[PDB]
Amino acid sequence: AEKPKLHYFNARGRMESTRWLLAAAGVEFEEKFIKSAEDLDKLRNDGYLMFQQVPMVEIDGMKLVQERAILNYIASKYNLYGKDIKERALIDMYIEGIADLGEMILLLPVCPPEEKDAKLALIKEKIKNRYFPAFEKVLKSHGQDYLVGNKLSRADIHLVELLYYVEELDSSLISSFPLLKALKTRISNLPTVKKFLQPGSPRKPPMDEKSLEEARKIFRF
Amino acid sequence: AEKPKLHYFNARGRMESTRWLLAAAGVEFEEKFIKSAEDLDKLRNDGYLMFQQVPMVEIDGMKLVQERAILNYIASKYNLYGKDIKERALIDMYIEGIADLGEMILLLPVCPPEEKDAKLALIKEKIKNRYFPAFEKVLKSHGQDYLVGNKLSRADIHLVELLYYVEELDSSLISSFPLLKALKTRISNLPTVKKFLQPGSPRKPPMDEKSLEEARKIFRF
Ligand SMILES: COc1ccc(CSC[C@H](NC(=O)CCCN)C(=O)NCC(=O)O)cc1
Numbered sequence: 001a002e003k004p005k006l007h008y009f010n011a012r013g014r015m016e017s018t019r020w021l022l023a024a025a026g027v028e029f030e031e032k033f034i035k036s037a038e039d040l041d042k043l044r045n046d047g048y049l050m051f052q053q054v055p056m057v058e059i060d061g062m063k064l065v066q067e068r069a070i071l072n073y074i075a076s077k078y079n080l081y082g083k084d085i086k087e088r089a090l091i092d093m094y095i096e097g098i099a100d101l102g103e104m105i106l107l108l109p110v111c112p113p114e115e116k117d118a119k120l121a122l123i124k125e126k127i128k129n130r131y132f133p134a135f136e137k138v139l140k141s142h143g144q145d146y147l148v149g150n151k152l153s154r155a156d157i158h159l160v161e162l163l164y165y166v167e168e169l170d171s172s173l174i175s176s177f178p179l180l181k182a183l184k185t186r187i188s189n190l191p192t193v194k195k196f197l198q199p200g201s202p203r204k205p206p207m208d209e210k211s212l213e214e215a216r217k218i219f220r221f
Numbered sequence: 222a223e224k225p226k227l228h229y230f231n232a233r234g235r236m237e238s239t240r241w242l243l244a245a246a247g248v249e250f251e252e253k254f255i256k257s258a259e260d261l262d263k264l265r266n267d268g269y270l271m272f273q274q275v276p277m278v279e280i281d282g283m284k285l286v287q288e289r290a291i292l293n294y295i296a297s298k299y300n301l302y303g304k305d306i307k308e309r310a311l312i313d314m315y316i317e318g319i320a321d322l323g324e325m326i327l328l329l330p331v332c333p334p335e336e337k338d339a340k341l342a343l344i345k346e347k348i349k350n351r352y353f354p355a356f357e358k359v360l361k362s363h364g365q366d367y368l369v370g371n372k373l374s375r376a377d378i379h380l381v382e383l384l385y386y387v388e389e390l391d392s393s394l395i396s397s398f399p400l401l402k403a404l405k406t407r408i409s410n411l412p413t414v415k416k417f418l419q420p421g422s423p424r425k426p427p428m429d430e431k432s433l434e435e436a437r438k439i440f441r442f
Pocket residue numbers: 013014052053054055066067106107109110207212215219317321
């Protein structure tokens with residue numbers, strides 16, 4: 001069973017959701033960490049990166065770049081993309097909202113320092129008034145344990161990953177959303193996810209100033 | 222089955238790729254233009270916008286928001302998403318690179334005035350050195366008339382749409398990419414696309430200063 005190989009630097013960034021999804025699905029992977037700009041250039045010069053960027057995942061004979069292409073593939077392969085085209089639409093709608101919020105959070109430390117305070121406030125406003133109410137409403141609507149189809153899907157995994165990041169940001173933000181809290185708990189207790197959340201897994205820590213500088217070095221921004 | 226109904230303002234923006242894809246698929250659709258902040262607020266208040274944003278498309282009983290959710294559903298529904306999981310992986314990689322370049326171009330007029338010139342220069346370098354070479358290389362690899370599976374897919378439609386925007390930016394950018402020029406011609410001559418390119422279709426013009434101010438008042442930015 002040829003192990004997916006994840007090409008990225010040693011940090012969450014744009015590869016972390018893939019780590020979560022693979023782990024949730026019970027899929028053992030290996031990581032090849034990029035440690036320098038010359039490591040990145042070697043991947044490029046070797047023809048591994050369609051758009052000269054990473055993440056790249058070697059899986060099932062493909063060299064897949066673009067986080068959404070990677071995740072869509074994994075989700076479909078491991079039956080985490082719902083049962084039909086209509087369930088996929090709900091899943092897609094939900095996870096695209098999750099991705100918008102996740103992007104805001106991801107880029108927050110790369111924000112011009114003069115914009116950081118207002119943008120943090122905007123994110124917190126959006127969490128409390130836009131995103132968390134949307135997902136709370138979906139869960140309340142059907143009263144089922146999962147977002148879509150009464151069955152585990154990538155939507156549950158991606159939302160719960162985001163809930164962990166929001167907790168890191170401000171642990172109060174979830175406080176008025178009991179159904180999200182309950183989903184976090186249930187999903188975090190699934191054996192594959194529980195193992196991923198335990199010390200020693202490939203799960204990556206929050207990116208510190210230093211890891212961010214290693215990114216600026218490697219990717220030249 | 223209802224005719225799909227597209228909720229957006231009367232401009233390209235984030236709904237235009239949906240108009241291209243539906244039109245290319247031969248699917249008749251209706252539009253309901255938002256003209257004020259109040260129209261948008263009515264859709265939000267009445268519960269039809271999961272994340273309080275448009276585009277929203279009413280299709281097959283869903284109120285689908287999020288452009289990628291909308292496009293994924295339409296592509297699957299109309300057999301424009303390839304024939305298997307690995308073809309979808311190529312399609313997704315391709316269209317995610319298209320979206321990255323498209324997003325840059327979309328947001329150019331909303332750049333601070335003093336950053337706009339430098340951002341245009343960077344977009345032009347990326348077109349010439351990163352994106353056009355990637356898609357040229359795909360077309361060269363198989364020499365076929367379509368990007369994937371020797372069959373029209375969403376990737377051909379989204380690519381050709383982008384080639385039209387690039388042409389507006391600078392008609393010289395494609396000049397050294399003969400296979401891209403040929404794809405633009407062929408796809409533009411497909412009966413459905415031809416009709417969409419002709420007058421009187423739902424295709425939208427470039428956004429001018431007056432349309433941008435309309436967006437600023439409806440969406441409050
Ligand atoms: C705040 O933390 C980070 C750390 C790294 C990155 C950059 S991820 C590597 C980058 N890839 C992309 O931008 C892919 C997006 C596709 N939709 C990359 O490879 N950059 C090199 C380059 O663009 O030349 C972003 C936020």
